[PDB]
Design a protein around this ligand. Structure first.
Ligand SMILES: *C/C=C(C)/C=C/C=C(C)/C=C/C1=C(C)CCCC1(C)C
Length: 227
């Protein structure tokens, strides 16, 4: 097929793979139980992304959806990825600040909605309805971000400064990167079709990698993961 976006996907496949192996090798060495906990979670994240980037690189996870008079290319493998990686990332922030079970469940549930409605919207054939779903998905995301900024940060102040400071960074990177996804979707192939697929894939790969390997590197090299 040789599609214009394949290179970004070949690049993102390689970064997710490298990041996975490094986190894997580093965590197989750690003896502390909950350091292990954080390692196990942070390694699985890019591992999943890798498999998905790799499947897409290989021609899977792609579907043509009809709307706006065109046969639009929609990479659904993405949601298969995010469906499990996004909640895992949230779990990590939750474990860091000792979030409560109820909080966690609510975050993972909101997260389920966000990716679910997102996909439904990416698949919708009535142009204008694609944005209704998008809207809902974004609302869900905002709920998540609100909790993290208002809820979590608050509980991160019952921990040691080292832990609170590691959390604020991770919280920050997350707020900035996550915020970007809905905008990329809106102006990209799934939305207005203004940014071409190849550039769109480049944006997502930069965000996916930053948010997973970038997030992992920061968290794992901190002593806040120790019991
Ligand atoms: C490793 C992947 C990460 C951290 C992915 C984060 C993805 C989002 C914050 C996605 C959000 C979306 C919306 C708010 C609405 C439209 C559809 C999505 C799923 C692209």
């Amino acid at each position: 097929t040789g599609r214009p976006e394949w290179i970004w996907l070949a690049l993102g496949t390689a970064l997710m793979g490298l990041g996975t192996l490094y986190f894997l090798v580093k965590g197989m060495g750690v003896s502390d139980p909950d350091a292990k906990k954080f390692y196990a979670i942070a390694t699985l994240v890019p591992a999943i992304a890798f498999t998905m980037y790799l499947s897409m690189l290989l021609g899977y996870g792609l579907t043509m959806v009809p709307f706006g008079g065109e046969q639009n290319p929609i990479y659904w493998a993405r949601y298969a990825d995010w469906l499990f990686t996004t909640p895992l990332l949230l779990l990590d922030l939750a474990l860091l600040v000792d979030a409560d079970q109820g909080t966690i469940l609510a975050l993972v549930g909101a997260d389920g909605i966000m990716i679910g409605t997102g996909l439904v919207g990416a698949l919708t054939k009535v142009y204008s309805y694609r944005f209704v779903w998008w809207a809902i998905s974004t609302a869900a995301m905002l709920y998540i971000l609100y909790v993290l900024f208002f809820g979590f940060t608050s509980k991160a102040e019952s921990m040691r400064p080292e832990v609170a400071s590691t959390f604020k960074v991770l919280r920050n990177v997350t707020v900035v990167l996550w915020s970007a996804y809905p905008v990329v979707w809106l102006i990209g192939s799934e939305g207005a079709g203004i940014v071409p697929l190849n550039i769109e894939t480049l944006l997502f790969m930069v965000l996916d990698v930053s948010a997973k390997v970038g997030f992992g590197l920061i968290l794992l090299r901190s002593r806040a993961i120790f019991g």
